[PDB]
Design an enzyme around this catalytic site. Sequence first.
Site, mmCIF file in Angstrom:
data_model
loop_
_atom_site.group_PDB
_atom_site.id
_atom_site.type_symbol
_atom_site.label_atom_id
_atom_site.label_comp_id
_atom_site.label_asym_id
_atom_site.label_seq_id
_atom_site.Cartn_x
_atom_site.Cartn_y
_atom_site.Cartn_z
ATOM 1 N N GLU B 86 0.809 -1.228 0.000
ATOM 2 C CA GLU B 86 0.000 0.000 0.000
ATOM 3 C C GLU B 86 0.838 1.271 0.000
ATOM 4 O O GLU B 86 0.392 2.317 0.464
ATOM 5 C CB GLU B 86 -0.980 -0.010 1.167
ATOM 6 C CG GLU B 86 -1.969 -1.146 1.008
ATOM 7 C CD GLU B 86 -3.306 -0.984 1.687
ATOM 8 O OE1 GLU B 86 -3.694 0.139 2.092
ATOM 9 O OE2 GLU B 86 -4.019 -2.020 1.756
ATOM 10 N N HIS B 143 -5.163 2.278 0.563
ATOM 11 C CA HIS B 143 -4.432 3.174 -0.315
ATOM 12 C C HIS B 143 -4.302 2.529 -1.672
ATOM 13 O O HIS B 143 -3.868 1.380 -1.758
ATOM 14 C CB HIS B 143 -3.033 3.484 0.254
ATOM 15 C CG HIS B 143 -3.075 3.798 1.709
ATOM 16 N ND1 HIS B 143 -3.224 2.815 2.654
ATOM 17 C CD2 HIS B 143 -3.121 4.974 2.373
ATOM 18 C CE1 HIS B 143 -3.358 3.379 3.843
ATOM 19 N NE2 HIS B 143 -3.302 4.689 3.700
ATOM 20 N N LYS B 170 -10.347 5.389 6.498
ATOM 21 C CA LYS B 170 -9.461 6.266 5.714
ATOM 22 C C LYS B 170 -9.183 5.652 4.364
ATOM 23 O O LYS B 170 -8.840 4.470 4.266
ATOM 24 C CB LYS B 170 -8.133 6.485 6.457
ATOM 25 C CG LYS B 170 -7.139 7.320 5.650
ATOM 26 C CD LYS B 170 -5.957 7.758 6.463
ATOM 27 C CE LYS B 170 -4.950 6.639 6.618
ATOM 28 N NZ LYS B 170 -3.814 6.637 5.663
HETATM 29 C C1 LIG Z 1 -2.860 7.600 6.011
HETATM 30 C C2 LIG Z 1 -1.709 7.806 5.060
HETATM 31 C C3 LIG Z 1 -2.040 9.020 4.189
HETATM 32 C C4 LIG Z 1 -0.844 9.474 3.385
HETATM 33 C C5 LIG Z 1 -1.295 10.632 2.514
HETATM 34 O O1 LIG Z 1 -1.793 10.370 1.390
HETATM 35 O O2 LIG Z 1 -1.141 11.822 2.926
HETATM 36 C C6 LIG Z 1 0.326 9.791 4.315
HETATM 37 C C7 LIG Z 1 0.684 8.504 5.078
HETATM 38 O O3 LIG Z 1 1.823 8.735 5.924
HETATM 39 C C8 LIG Z 1 -0.483 8.037 5.910
HETATM 40 O O4 LIG Z 1 -0.167 6.826 6.577
#
Ligand SMILES: *C[C@H]1C[C@@H](C(=O)O)C[C@@H](O)[C@@H]1O
Lengths: 252, 252
Positions: B86, B143, B170
């Site tokens: 991810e 993600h 999220k």
């Molecule tokens: C939750 C994710 C979101 C990421 C982003 O797209 O800003 C940054 C990453 O460090 C986080 O874990």
Amino acid sequence: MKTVTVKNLIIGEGMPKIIVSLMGRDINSVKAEALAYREATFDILEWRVDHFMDIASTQSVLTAARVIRDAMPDIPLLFTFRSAKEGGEQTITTQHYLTLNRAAIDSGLVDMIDLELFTGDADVKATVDYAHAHNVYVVMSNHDFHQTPSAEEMVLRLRKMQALGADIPKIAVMPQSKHDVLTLLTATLEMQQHYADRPVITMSMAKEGVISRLAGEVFGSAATFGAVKQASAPGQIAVNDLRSVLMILHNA
Amino acid sequence: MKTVTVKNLIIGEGMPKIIVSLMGRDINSVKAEALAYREATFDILEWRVDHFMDIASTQSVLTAARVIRDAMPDIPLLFTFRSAKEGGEQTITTQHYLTLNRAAIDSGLVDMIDLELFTGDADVKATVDYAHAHNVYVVMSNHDFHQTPSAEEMVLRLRKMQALGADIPKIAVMPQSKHDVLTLLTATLEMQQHYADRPVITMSMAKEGVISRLAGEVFGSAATFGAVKQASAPGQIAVNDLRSVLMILHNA
Ligand SMILES: *C[C@H]1C[C@@H](C(=O)O)C[C@@H](O)[C@@H]1O
Ligand SMILES: *C[C@H]1C[C@@H](C(=O)O)C[C@@H](O)[C@@H]1O
């Protein structure tokens, strides 16, 4: 795309251009506002002629235009009578509306005029051709202070403005929901992706629509309005805050 | 709506909360980063554990967590191992991933953990229940670094996270067009309007998606990530610039 250049400002490239609106009821207040406005930072000055009370006199209107141009000799100047029908301060006849705009064109004092699409096709086209014969650009406009049309309707409306000769089609609509804000952005993006012949200006008004006044660069609104002290339409934010956001988005 | 309060920060009300990510490869760099980060202004500290090279040792990981908590005793602290699958920095087994998260939970040092939805339903649910038994909240995450699913798919994915017990679903997705950015905003708004049981965090990544990192208040993203010096994902802007924009939108 055919961009519009006024005094070394290129509309339809780069960062959305910041417009502020000067609202003076009388000659003394126009003077005072012009002197205050020239100490603000923005790209285009709009004179909201419908706020001026001595509207019946073409010469009084021209005297006020000159006060503004004298105060700011180098600013792009947009002459706008906004009808009460489209959310402005007063009502005049169509013939007087055309007379005022033609007098503005003839004066050499203004770079651009606003023409409301729904004035009527034949009058609008004739006045566009008059403006173009005298090296004045036309922001052709429409405002719905009640509701947001569908994206398809808004696209067809902006395309009609293009067909009538608008240099810069413009639409402002009132959201009744957050979804309506997305509808306005969707229509804006459709122009950018599929009808990118003229710069267009779009906005969703009021508090819910404020994001549309900030996101012009990504989705394709060529200009955006900020407030010096009082908004000229619902949803405008303080001009310096507008400028800060535009720069952050341009540089992101 | 069921908001999430961590150390007097209320997630799911008011302005979107600003998250920054601490990335240190080793114990000395975690120390240095923690001391720098405590001189920045933000709401939640995320420790990106996948950047830490000594991942195999649970005790080394816990020592680093303590360095961070010692440097910032009052900050909401989110423990995140982002898998390479991810978009993170490295790959570990599912069992080791769960072990690290459970050790973080047990330590009392962290307020929240990140759990990737696609780890697998049964493992995710068991780990959510373990977190909840020990007063730790779960940001459940997904993600897509390649593309943007449909709005309908994204809504169903966020709803599944809710069903598995996420405190804060999220999703981060990669736009391949400007239209994809609007799709992400559309899905966000659908959660706000029709599935408003949990705060959700949403973002469209990369340069085209930056507006999604700014417009959380209007469309319903409860938090947004900024960069202290280096971005932890594409599209993050400088944290102070992020904060400036959020305040302008909150106060508009
Ligand atoms: C939750 C994710 C979101 C990421 C982003 O797209 O800003 C940054 C990453 O460090 C986080 O874990
Ligand atoms: C072109 C319109 C746009 C209005 C707005 O919604 O910001 C402001 C008004 O003065 C302009 O004539």
